[PDB]
Amino acid sequence: VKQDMPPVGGYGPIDYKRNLPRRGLSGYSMFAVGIGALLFGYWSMMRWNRERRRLQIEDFEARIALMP
Amino acid sequence: MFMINVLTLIIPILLAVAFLTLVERKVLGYMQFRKGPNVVGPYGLLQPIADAIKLFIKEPLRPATSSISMFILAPILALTLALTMWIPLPMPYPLINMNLGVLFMLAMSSLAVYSILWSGWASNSKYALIGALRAVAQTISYEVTLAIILLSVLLMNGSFTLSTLIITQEQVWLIFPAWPLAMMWFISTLAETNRAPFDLTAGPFALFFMAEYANIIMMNIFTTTLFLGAFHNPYMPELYTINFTIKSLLLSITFLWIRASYPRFRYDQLMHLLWKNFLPLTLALCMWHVSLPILLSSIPPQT
């Protein structure tokens, strides 16, 4: 009998592919998302700014009527 | 009570820096396949206490310097900047309510540039002078850009008071009206704190090290304050303190995590990169943030 170490029954395949799935989407979608979220933030910032303008005018009314 | 406030603000910075050293070593360790330091005590806290006290024990190299008084004068300046420079940054109610503090932030960063230059002069012979001179140049290359971006991000906020900032970031975070401006700002904060991907390649290395990591925690605290923050309810501010500390922790981890996985830049590539890529784009974002609020009919209510 012989007791070397051959490949017992053959070994299966071994990959060597450059498998890069390319996660993400196209860049035009990235520009669309960026400009959309940016403009969303601009509109919300505009609304909050003019609300605080209203309250700032009310504080001006306080300092005007409080003075004499 | 005022010196009690002073002690409660400037005593825990040493604990903050040493525990930041263990935090960044453990974070780099789990970015690698490493544990450690965990053999020395429970999860390695008295191990930063121990190597800090060892480096205070360990005997200095005898000078071999020139102008011993100047060798005194540079790291004392770096560490006193790192001590004085957490004052107007609001954890909910800040230490000194100022009319203007962010120009003070940038000017104190310029004083840190002075300290780096004085250490590089007073250290040693010519090659250390050349290396520290290039380091001063790549630190001074960004107080143009970071101050310009600061000006652009608080042009939407009117005043320098920083409490109007902590008010007017209640609705949406300011990361949304300026994402590329903020991203270039964060790159410039990596440049101010001078870590990888921005290269470096003496004494006291403990004090140099201390000033650098307090500068890191300072810039990330000012990052969290400048761009975001949740709603502040008075007569319960511990909520804002907790949420502030959590987001500053997450951004400091992200900061070290950006350090963890990129090669250093070539020096001329760094200058080429900064000038010919950031500086026209920062100007363009400045002029568009000038021309925007006259078009949204919303100049900020500058009190």
Side-chain angles (χ1 to χ4, degrees):
Chain A
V1 296
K2 296 183 290 294
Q3 287 294 320
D4 289 332
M5 191 62 206
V8 179
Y11 288 163
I14 299 98
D15 55 351
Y16 61 94
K17 185 188 287 185
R18 290 184 65 188
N19 192 0
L20 298 176
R22 294 180 66 251
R23 184 260 177 88
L25 293 174
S26 177
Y28 182 77
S29 65
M30 188 67 204
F31 283 109
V33 169
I35 296 300
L38 181 271
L39 188 62
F40 176 75
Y42 279 170
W43 182 69
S44 182
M45 192 67 204
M46 175 267 178
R47 194 264 300 163
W48 179 253
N49 279 122
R50 295 184 72 244
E51 288 185 354
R52 197 180 170 187
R53 294 300 302 276
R54 295 178 182 176
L55 298 175
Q56 206 282 127
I57 296 168
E58 288 184 352
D59 295 332
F60 275 169
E61 289 182 348
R63 62 87 50 86
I64 287 170
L66 197 61
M67 193 181 76
Chain B
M1 298 301 292
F2 189 75
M3 71 285 199
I4 301 170
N5 287 314
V6 169
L7 290 178
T8 56
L9 187 60
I10 76 169
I11 291 171
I13 65 98
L14 299 177
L15 277 301
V17 170
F19 294 161
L20 183 71
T21 62
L22 72 91
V23 160
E24 77 171 5
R25 188 177 295 117
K26 291 293 292 296
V27 164
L28 291 173
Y30 289 110
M31 294 307 295
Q32 185 173 344
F33 295 101
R34 290 181 296 180
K35 293 181 181 181
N38 53 2
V39 175
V40 180
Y43 295 158
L45 285 75
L46 69 163
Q47 167 62 42
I49 300 299
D51 70 357
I53 196 64
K54 185 187 75 67
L55 203 278
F56 283 165
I57 283 171
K58 185 176 180 180
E59 182 174 359
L61 296 173
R62 54 98 61 215
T65 63
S66 297
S67 185
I68 300 169
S69 180
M70 202 69 203
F71 183 72
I72 300 297
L73 198 275
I76 189 73
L77 181 62
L79 197 141
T80 195
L81 294 170
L83 285 177
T84 55
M85 272 290 284
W86 287 7
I87 294 172
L89 292 172
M91 56 292 294
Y93 293 155
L95 198 279
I96 296 297
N97 296 109
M98 299 175 73
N99 195 3
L100 48 93
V102 293
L103 208 158
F104 183 75
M105 301 293 101
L106 265 295
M108 290 273 105
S109 179
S110 297
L111 267 297
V113 179
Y114 283 110
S115 179
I116 296 170
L117 189 145
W118 284 345
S119 179
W121 180 264
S123 293
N124 202 357
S125 295
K126 282 81 175 174
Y127 182 73
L129 183 62
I130 296 169
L133 192 67
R134 290 183 290 173
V136 168
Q138 64 91 27
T139 308
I140 203 173
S141 300
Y142 290 86
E143 294 178 355
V144 167
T145 301
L146 193 144
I148 276 172
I149 292 171
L150 178 69
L151 188 68
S152 295
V153 297
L154 61 86
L155 181 54
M156 299 299 292
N157 296 311
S159 297
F160 293 166
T161 64
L162 183 63
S163 180
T164 57
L165 181 58
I166 203 171
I167 293 302
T168 56
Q169 287 184 354
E170 63 89 23
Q171 186 64 41
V172 297
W173 297 345
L174 200 60
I175 191 70
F176 288 161
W179 57 275
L181 190 62
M183 190 173 289
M184 296 160 75
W185 192 76
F186 183 67
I187 296 169
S188 295
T189 57
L190 269 81
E192 291 292 326
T193 57
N194 300 118
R195 300 177 70 83
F198 300 145
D199 57 352
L200 293 175
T201 61
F205 183 75
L207 304 180
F208 181 80
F209 190 73
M210 190 72 69
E212 282 187 350
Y213 289 8
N215 194 356
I216 292 162
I217 299 172
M218 182 189 78
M219 288 297 175
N220 292 323
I221 284 169
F222 181 69
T223 309
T224 302
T225 305
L226 184 63
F227 287 155
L228 49 92
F231 62 95
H232 173 74
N233 192 3
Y235 59 87
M236 192 178 288
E238 295 181 355
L239 180 63
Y240 182 73
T241 308
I242 286 170
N243 198 359
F244 180 76
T245 304
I246 284 171
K247 288 180 174 66
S248 179
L249 259 287
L250 290 176
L251 198 142
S252 177
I253 294 299
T254 304
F255 182 80
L256 193 274
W257 175 58
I258 289 172
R259 180 185 181 270
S261 300
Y262 289 100
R264 295 180 296 172
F265 292 181
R266 194 173 66 192
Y267 182 77
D268 295 337
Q269 288 181 357
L270 182 64
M271 296 299 176
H272 175 78
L273 180 141
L274 178 270
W275 294 101
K276 297 181 187 178
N277 298 114
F278 288 95
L279 194 60
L281 192 58
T282 53
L283 290 173
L285 290 177
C286 281
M287 65 189 290
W288 184 47
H289 288 87
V290 167
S291 64
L292 182 71
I294 205 66
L295 290 172
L296 292 176
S297 293
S298 303
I299 63 166
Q302 182 181 358
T303 302

